[PDB]
Short mmCIF file of all heavy atoms in Angstrom, two decimals:
data_model
loop_
_atom_site.label_atom_id
_atom_site.label_comp_id
_atom_site.label_asym_id
_atom_site.label_seq_id
_atom_site.Cartn_x
_atom_site.Cartn_y
_atom_site.Cartn_z
N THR A 221 20.91 193.76 143.44
CA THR A 221 20.32 195.09 143.59
C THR A 221 19.20 195.01 144.62
O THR A 221 18.92 193.95 145.19
CB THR A 221 19.80 195.61 142.25
OG1 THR A 221 19.38 196.98 142.40
CG2 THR A 221 18.62 194.78 141.76
N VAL A 222 18.55 196.14 144.86
CA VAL A 222 17.45 196.25 145.82
C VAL A 222 16.21 196.68 145.06
O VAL A 222 16.20 197.73 144.40
CB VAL A 222 17.78 197.24 146.95
CG1 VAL A 222 16.57 197.40 147.87
CG2 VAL A 222 18.99 196.77 147.73
N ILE A 223 15.15 195.87 145.15
CA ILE A 223 13.89 196.12 144.46
C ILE A 223 12.77 196.13 145.49
O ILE A 223 12.79 195.35 146.45
CB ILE A 223 13.63 195.05 143.38
CG1 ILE A 223 14.79 195.00 142.38
CG2 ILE A 223 12.33 195.33 142.64
CD1 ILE A 223 15.04 196.31 141.66
N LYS A 224 11.80 197.02 145.30
CA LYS A 224 10.65 197.12 146.19
C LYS A 224 9.54 196.24 145.65
O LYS A 224 8.95 196.54 144.60
CB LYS A 224 10.18 198.57 146.30
CG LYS A 224 11.18 199.52 146.94
CD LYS A 224 10.64 200.95 146.91
CE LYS A 224 11.61 201.93 147.55
NZ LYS A 224 11.12 203.33 147.47
N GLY A 225 9.24 195.15 146.35
CA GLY A 225 8.19 194.25 145.94
C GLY A 225 8.54 192.82 146.31
O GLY A 225 9.43 192.58 147.12
N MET A 226 7.82 191.89 145.70
CA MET A 226 8.06 190.46 145.86
C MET A 226 8.36 189.88 144.48
O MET A 226 7.48 189.85 143.61
CB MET A 226 6.87 189.76 146.51
CG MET A 226 7.09 188.28 146.79
SD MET A 226 5.70 187.53 147.65
CE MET A 226 5.95 188.16 149.31
N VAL A 227 9.59 189.41 144.29
CA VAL A 227 10.01 188.88 142.99
C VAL A 227 9.39 187.50 142.79
O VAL A 227 9.46 186.64 143.66
CB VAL A 227 11.54 188.82 142.90
CG1 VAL A 227 11.97 188.16 141.60
CG2 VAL A 227 12.13 190.22 143.02
N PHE A 228 8.77 187.30 141.62
CA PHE A 228 8.14 186.04 141.26
C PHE A 228 9.01 185.34 140.23
O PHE A 228 9.27 185.88 139.15
CB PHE A 228 6.73 186.27 140.71
CG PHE A 228 5.77 186.85 141.71
CD1 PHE A 228 4.63 187.51 141.30
CD2 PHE A 228 6.01 186.73 143.07
CE1 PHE A 228 3.75 188.04 142.21
CE2 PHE A 228 5.13 187.25 143.99
CZ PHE A 228 4.00 187.91 143.57
N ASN A 229 9.46 184.13 140.56
CA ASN A 229 10.32 183.35 139.69
C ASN A 229 9.55 182.38 138.79
O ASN A 229 10.18 181.65 138.02
CB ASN A 229 11.35 182.57 140.52
CG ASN A 229 12.38 183.47 141.16
OD1 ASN A 229 12.63 184.59 140.70
ND2 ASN A 229 12.99 183.00 142.24
N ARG A 230 8.23 182.37 138.88
CA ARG A 230 7.43 181.46 138.07
C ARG A 230 7.30 181.98 136.64
O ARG A 230 7.41 183.18 136.37
CB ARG A 230 6.04 181.27 138.69
CG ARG A 230 6.05 180.51 140.00
CD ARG A 230 4.66 180.41 140.59
NE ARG A 230 3.76 179.65 139.73
CZ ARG A 230 3.66 178.32 139.75
NH1 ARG A 230 4.40 177.61 140.58
NH2 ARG A 230 2.81 177.71 138.93
N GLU A 231 7.07 181.04 135.72
CA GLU A 231 6.89 181.40 134.32
C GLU A 231 5.59 182.17 134.12
O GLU A 231 4.64 182.01 134.89
CB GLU A 231 6.89 180.14 133.45
CG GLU A 231 8.22 179.40 133.43
CD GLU A 231 8.17 178.13 132.61
OE1 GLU A 231 7.06 177.73 132.20
OE2 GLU A 231 9.24 177.54 132.36
N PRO A 232 5.52 183.02 133.10
CA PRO A 232 4.29 183.80 132.87
C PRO A 232 3.10 182.95 132.46
O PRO A 232 1.96 183.42 132.57
CB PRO A 232 4.68 184.78 131.76
CG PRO A 232 5.79 184.09 131.04
CD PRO A 232 6.56 183.35 132.10
N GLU A 233 3.32 181.72 131.98
CA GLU A 233 2.30 180.74 131.63
C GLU A 233 1.45 181.15 130.43
O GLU A 233 0.59 180.37 130.01
CB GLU A 233 1.36 180.42 132.81
CG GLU A 233 2.05 179.72 133.97
CD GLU A 233 1.11 179.48 135.14
OE1 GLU A 233 -0.02 180.01 135.12
OE2 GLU A 233 1.50 178.76 136.08
N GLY A 234 1.65 182.34 129.87
CA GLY A 234 0.83 182.80 128.76
C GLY A 234 1.63 183.67 127.82
O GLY A 234 2.78 184.03 128.08
N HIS A 235 1.00 184.00 126.69
CA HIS A 235 1.65 184.79 125.65
C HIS A 235 1.94 186.22 126.07
O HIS A 235 2.73 186.89 125.40
CB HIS A 235 0.78 184.79 124.38
CG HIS A 235 0.59 183.44 123.78
ND1 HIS A 235 -0.38 183.19 122.82
CD2 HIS A 235 1.23 182.27 123.99
CE1 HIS A 235 -0.32 181.91 122.47
NE2 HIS A 235 0.65 181.33 123.16
N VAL A 236 1.35 186.70 127.16
CA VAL A 236 1.58 188.05 127.64
C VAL A 236 2.69 187.99 128.68
O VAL A 236 2.50 187.45 129.78
CB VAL A 236 0.30 188.68 128.22
CG1 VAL A 236 0.60 190.05 128.80
CG2 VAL A 236 -0.77 188.77 127.15
N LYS A 237 3.85 188.56 128.35
CA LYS A 237 4.98 188.55 129.28
C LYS A 237 4.85 189.64 130.33
O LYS A 237 5.14 189.40 131.51
CB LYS A 237 6.29 188.70 128.51
CG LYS A 237 6.62 187.53 127.60
CD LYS A 237 7.89 187.78 126.81
CE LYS A 237 8.23 186.60 125.91
NZ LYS A 237 9.44 186.85 125.09
N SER A 238 4.42 190.83 129.93
CA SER A 238 4.31 191.95 130.86
C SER A 238 3.27 192.93 130.34
O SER A 238 2.89 192.90 129.17
CB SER A 238 5.66 192.66 131.05
OG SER A 238 6.11 193.23 129.83
N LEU A 239 2.82 193.80 131.24
CA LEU A 239 1.82 194.81 130.90
C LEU A 239 2.52 196.07 130.39
O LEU A 239 3.73 196.09 130.15
CB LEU A 239 0.94 195.10 132.12
CG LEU A 239 0.09 193.93 132.62
CD1 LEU A 239 -0.64 194.31 133.90
CD2 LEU A 239 -0.89 193.48 131.55
N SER A 240 1.75 197.14 130.20
CA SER A 240 2.30 198.39 129.70
C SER A 240 2.97 199.17 130.83
O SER A 240 3.09 198.70 131.97
CB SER A 240 1.20 199.22 129.04
OG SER A 240 0.21 199.59 129.98
N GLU A 241 3.42 200.38 130.51
CA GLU A 241 4.10 201.24 131.47
C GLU A 241 3.15 202.17 132.21
O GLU A 241 3.61 203.00 133.00
CB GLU A 241 5.18 202.07 130.76
CG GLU A 241 6.34 201.24 130.22
CD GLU A 241 7.36 202.08 129.48
OE1 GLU A 241 7.08 203.28 129.23
OE2 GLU A 241 8.44 201.55 129.14
N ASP A 242 1.85 202.07 131.96
CA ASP A 242 0.88 202.93 132.63
C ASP A 242 0.83 202.62 134.12
O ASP A 242 0.94 201.46 134.53
CB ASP A 242 -0.50 202.76 132.00
CG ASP A 242 -1.52 203.75 132.55
OD1 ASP A 242 -1.14 204.64 133.34
OD2 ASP A 242 -2.71 203.65 132.17
N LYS A 243 0.67 203.66 134.93
CA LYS A 243 0.61 203.49 136.37
C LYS A 243 -0.74 202.90 136.79
O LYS A 243 -1.73 202.99 136.07
CB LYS A 243 0.85 204.82 137.08
CG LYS A 243 2.25 205.38 136.90
CD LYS A 243 2.39 206.74 137.57
CE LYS A 243 3.80 207.29 137.41
NZ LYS A 243 3.93 208.65 138.00
N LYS A 244 -0.75 202.30 137.98
CA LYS A 244 -1.95 201.74 138.60
C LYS A 244 -2.59 200.67 137.72
O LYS A 244 -3.68 200.84 137.16
CB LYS A 244 -2.95 202.86 138.94
CG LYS A 244 -2.47 203.83 140.01
CD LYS A 244 -3.47 204.95 140.23
CE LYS A 244 -3.00 205.91 141.31
NZ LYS A 244 -3.94 207.04 141.50
N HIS A 245 -1.88 199.55 137.60
CA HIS A 245 -2.42 198.38 136.94
C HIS A 245 -3.41 197.67 137.86
O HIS A 245 -3.10 197.41 139.02
CB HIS A 245 -1.30 197.42 136.53
CG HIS A 245 -0.35 197.99 135.52
ND1 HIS A 245 -0.70 198.20 134.21
CD2 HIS A 245 0.94 198.37 135.63
CE1 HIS A 245 0.33 198.70 133.55
NE2 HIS A 245 1.34 198.82 134.40
N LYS A 246 -4.59 197.35 137.33
CA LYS A 246 -5.61 196.65 138.10
C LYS A 246 -5.23 195.18 138.22
O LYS A 246 -5.04 194.50 137.21
CB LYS A 246 -6.98 196.81 137.45
CG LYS A 246 -7.50 198.24 137.47
CD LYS A 246 -8.83 198.35 136.73
CE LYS A 246 -9.37 199.77 136.77
NZ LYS A 246 -10.64 199.90 136.00
N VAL A 247 -5.12 194.69 139.45
CA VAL A 247 -4.74 193.31 139.74
C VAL A 247 -5.84 192.67 140.57
O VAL A 247 -6.25 193.23 141.60
CB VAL A 247 -3.39 193.24 140.47
CG1 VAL A 247 -3.06 191.80 140.84
CG2 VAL A 247 -2.28 193.83 139.60
N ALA A 248 -6.31 191.51 140.13
CA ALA A 248 -7.36 190.76 140.82
C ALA A 248 -6.79 189.45 141.32
O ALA A 248 -6.15 188.71 140.56
CB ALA A 248 -8.55 190.51 139.90
N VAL A 249 -7.02 189.15 142.60
CA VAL A 249 -6.57 187.91 143.22
C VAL A 249 -7.78 187.01 143.42
O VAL A 249 -8.70 187.36 144.18
CB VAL A 249 -5.85 188.18 144.56
CG1 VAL A 249 -5.49 186.87 145.24
CG2 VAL A 249 -4.61 189.03 144.33
N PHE A 250 -7.78 185.87 142.75
CA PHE A 250 -8.88 184.92 142.81
C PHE A 250 -8.41 183.65 143.52
O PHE A 250 -7.48 182.99 143.05
CB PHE A 250 -9.40 184.58 141.41
CG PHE A 250 -10.02 185.75 140.69
CD1 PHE A 250 -10.14 185.75 139.31
CD2 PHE A 250 -10.48 186.85 141.40
CE1 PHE A 250 -10.71 186.82 138.65
CE2 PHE A 250 -11.05 187.92 140.74
CZ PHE A 250 -11.16 187.91 139.36
N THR A 251 -9.05 183.33 144.65
CA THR A 251 -8.70 182.12 145.38
C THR A 251 -9.29 180.88 144.71
O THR A 251 -8.61 179.85 144.60
CB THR A 251 -9.18 182.23 146.83
OG1 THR A 251 -8.54 183.35 147.46
CG2 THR A 251 -8.83 180.96 147.60
N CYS A 252 -10.54 180.96 144.27
CA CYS A 252 -11.16 179.84 143.60
C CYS A 252 -10.51 179.61 142.23
O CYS A 252 -10.28 180.57 141.49
CB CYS A 252 -12.66 180.08 143.43
SG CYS A 252 -13.58 178.72 142.67
N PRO A 253 -10.21 178.37 141.88
CA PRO A 253 -9.59 178.10 140.57
C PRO A 253 -10.55 178.39 139.43
O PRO A 253 -11.78 178.42 139.59
CB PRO A 253 -9.24 176.61 140.64
CG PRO A 253 -10.21 176.05 141.62
CD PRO A 253 -10.40 177.13 142.65
N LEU A 254 -9.97 178.61 138.25
CA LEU A 254 -10.75 178.94 137.06
C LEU A 254 -11.43 177.69 136.54
O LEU A 254 -10.77 176.68 136.26
CB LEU A 254 -9.84 179.55 135.99
CG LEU A 254 -9.19 180.89 136.36
CD1 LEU A 254 -8.22 181.33 135.27
CD2 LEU A 254 -10.24 181.96 136.61
N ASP A 255 -12.75 177.75 136.40
CA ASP A 255 -13.54 176.61 135.96
C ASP A 255 -14.88 177.14 135.46
O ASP A 255 -15.15 178.34 135.50
CB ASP A 255 -13.70 175.58 137.09
CG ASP A 255 -14.32 174.28 136.63
OD1 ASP A 255 -14.56 174.13 135.41
OD2 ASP A 255 -14.56 173.40 137.48
N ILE A 256 -15.73 176.23 134.97
CA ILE A 256 -17.05 176.61 134.49
C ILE A 256 -17.90 177.08 135.66
O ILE A 256 -17.79 176.57 136.78
CB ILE A 256 -17.70 175.43 133.74
CG1 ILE A 256 -19.04 175.85 133.13
CG2 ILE A 256 -17.88 174.23 134.67
CD1 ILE A 256 -19.62 174.84 132.16
N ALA A 257 -18.74 178.08 135.40
CA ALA A 257 -19.61 178.61 136.44
C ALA A 257 -20.65 177.57 136.85
O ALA A 257 -21.35 177.02 136.01
CB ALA A 257 -20.30 179.89 135.96
N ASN A 258 -20.74 177.31 138.15
CA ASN A 258 -21.65 176.33 138.70
C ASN A 258 -22.49 176.98 139.80
O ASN A 258 -22.38 178.18 140.06
CB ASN A 258 -20.90 175.11 139.24
CG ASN A 258 -20.27 174.28 138.13
OD1 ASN A 258 -20.95 173.52 137.45
ND2 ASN A 258 -18.96 174.42 137.96
N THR A 259 -23.32 176.17 140.44
CA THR A 259 -24.20 176.62 141.51
C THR A 259 -23.58 176.29 142.86
O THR A 259 -23.04 175.19 143.06
CB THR A 259 -25.58 175.98 141.40
OG1 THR A 259 -26.17 176.33 140.14
CG2 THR A 259 -26.49 176.46 142.52
N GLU A 260 -23.64 177.25 143.79
CA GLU A 260 -23.08 177.03 145.12
C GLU A 260 -23.80 175.89 145.84
O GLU A 260 -23.18 175.13 146.60
CB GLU A 260 -23.17 178.31 145.95
CG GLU A 260 -22.55 178.21 147.33
CD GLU A 260 -22.61 179.52 148.10
OE1 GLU A 260 -23.17 180.50 147.56
OE2 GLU A 260 -22.10 179.57 149.23
#
């Protein structure tokens, strides 16, 4: 079929498989890996 977007084949990695059906889901892209807050 034809889908608009970029299909991700990676596992969800967490207990949440998908979000709700509400429009305009807020998505945040973080380049720095998740770790304890430190000083620059």
Side-chain angles (χ1 to χ4, degrees):
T221 187
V222 176
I223 304 300
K224 295 176 180 178
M226 183 176 284
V227 175
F228 295 159
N229 291 336
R230 292 178 63 85
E231 294 178 351
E233 294 178 350
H235 297 166
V236 176
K237 294 177 179 177
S238 63
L239 296 175
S240 63
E241 294 178 350
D242 187 5
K243 294 177 179 177
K244 294 177 179 177
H245 296 289
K246 294 177 179 177
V247 176
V249 175
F250 295 159
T251 300
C252 183
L254 296 175
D255 189 4
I256 185 169
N258 291 283
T259 300
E260 183 178 2

